[PDB]
Amino acid sequence: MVKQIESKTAFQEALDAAGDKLVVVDFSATWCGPCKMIKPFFHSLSEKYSNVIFLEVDVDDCQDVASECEVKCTPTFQFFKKGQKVGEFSGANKEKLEATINELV
């Protein structure tokens, strides 16, 4: 189930309530258009992969979290596990998310 973050204190609990299963994050802009044009791709995995947790950070109201990952270009996909970063790749690519998840699955 995709989840939207709003602050850092939250970004923490999310990784604490996500158990240990893969935890992929979508650092992109929700207000922008072209950035949300790739949503029907990362937001559709909500029902497909029910064994994985997905998040969605808004680099507009959650710059604290973004500035935490030192991002400098959206959309940026990150991979967190047990609350520890293990993979991260940016670029408007979808066919990659799949195989990528198959990486740490």
Swiss-Prot record:
Recorded consequence of changing residue 70 to A: Strongly reduced interaction with CASP3
Thioredoxin domain boundaries: 2-105
Residue numbers carrying S-nitrosocysteine: 62, 69, 73
Sites marked Deprotonates C-terminal active site Cys: 26
Domain of life per record: Eukaryota
GO BP, sorted A to Z: cell redox homeostasis; cellular detoxification of hydrogen peroxide; negative regulation of protein export from nucleus; negative regulation of transcription by RNA polymerase II; positive regulation of DNA binding; positive regulation of peptidyl-cysteine S-nitrosylation; positive regulation of phosphatidylinositol 3-kinase/protein kinase B signal transduction; response to nitric oxide
Keyword Transcription: yes
Record's comment on post-translational modification: In the fully reduced protein, both Cys-69 and Cys-73 are nitrosylated in response to nitric oxide (NO). When two disulfide bonds are present in the protein, only Cys-73 is nitrosylated. Cys-73 can serve as donor for nitrosylation of target proteins. In case of infection, ubiquitinated by S.typhimurium protein slrP, leading to its degradation.
Sites bearing N6-acetyllysine, chain numbering: 3, 39, 94
Disulfide bond annotation, renumbered to this chain: 32-35
Induction notes from the record: Up-regulated by ionizing radiation.
Keywords: Acetylation, Activator, Allergen, Cytoplasm, Disulfide bond, Electron transport, Nucleus, Redox-active center, S-nitrosylation, Secreted, Transcription, Transcription regulation, Transport, Ubl conjugation
GO molecular function list: protein homodimerization activity; protein-disulfide reductase [NAD(P)H] activity; protein-disulfide reductase activity; RNA binding; thioredoxin-disulfide reductase (NADPH) activity
PROSITE patterns attached to this UniProt entry: THIOREDOXIN_1, THIOREDOXIN_2
Result of changing residue 69 to S: No effect on reducing activity, interaction with APEX1 and on S-nitrosylation of C-73. Retains interaction with APEX1 and transcription activation
Compartments, as annotated in UniProt: Nucleus; Cytoplasm; Secreted
Effect recorded for residue 72 to A: Strongly reduced interaction with CASP3
Active site: 32 (nucleophile), 35 (nucleophile)
GO-annotated cellular components: cytoplasm; cytosol; extracellular exosome; extracellular region; nucleoplasm; nucleus
Subunit structure of this chain's protein: Homodimer; disulfide-linked. Interacts with TXNIP through the redox-active site. Interacts with MAP3K5 and CASP3. In case of infection, interacts with S.typhimurium protein slrP. Interacts with APEX1; the interaction stimulates the FOS/JUN AP-1 DNA-binding activity in a redox-dependent manner.
UniProt similarity note: Belongs to the thioredoxin family.
Task performed by this protein: Participates in various redox reactions through the reversible oxidation of its active center dithiol to a disulfide and catalyzes dithiol-disulfide exchange reactions. Plays a role in the reversible S-nitrosylation of cysteine residues in target proteins, and thereby contributes to the response to intracellular nitric oxide. Nitrosylates the active site Cys of CASP3 in response to nitric oxide (NO), and thereby inhibits caspase-3 activity. ADF augments the expression of the interleukin-2 receptor TAC (IL2R/P55).
Name of the protein in its database record: Thioredoxin
Organism: Homo sapiens (Human)
